């Protein structure tokens, strides 16, 4: 039942995003786990800002 | 002195360009009306939350 950061794993990379709920969520791939789950962007911004920035930098468009 | 060497606290990114060959941000600094350019990679390290706020606003489907 623990989900996201409550699983106690290290974030590895963001592999999706959705704001359909009213808040921005990231699908987080965790280190040494096949099972990605959603986390609040607000939480990821604080706990792993460079992983967040990497997700944005790979999809820049002009 | 330019960019972060002005020693001002970053406040908001108000623009971006790649014309130097690397991504730069136009940084508006708090208590200064003179914005100027900083490397994105430097902003990533020094003010990641300001970088993220900029990107978050421009995320689009």
């Amino acid at each position: 039942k623990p989900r996201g950061f409550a699983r106690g794993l290290d974030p590895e990379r963001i592999i999706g995003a959705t704001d359909s709920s009213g808040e921005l969520m990231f699908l987080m791939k965790w280190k040494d786990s096949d099972e990605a789950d959603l986390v609040l962007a607000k939480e990821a911004n604080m706990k792993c800002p460079q992983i967040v920035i990497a997700f944005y930098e790979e999809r820049l468009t002009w | 002195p330019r960019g972060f060497a002005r020693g001002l606290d970053p406040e908001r990114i108000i623009g971006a360009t790649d014309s130097s060959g690397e991504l730069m941000f136009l940084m508006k600094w708090k208590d200064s009306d003179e914005a100027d350019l900083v490397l994105a990679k430097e902003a990533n390290m020094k003010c990641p939350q300001i970088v993220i706020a900029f990107y978050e606003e421009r995320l689009t489907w």
Partner: peptide, 12 residues
């Protein structure tokens, strides 16, 4: 079924 991007505009 769109892909998210960060949409920037070049200064000037």
């Amino acid at each position: 079924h769109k892909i998210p991007y960060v949409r920037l505009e070049r200064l000037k």
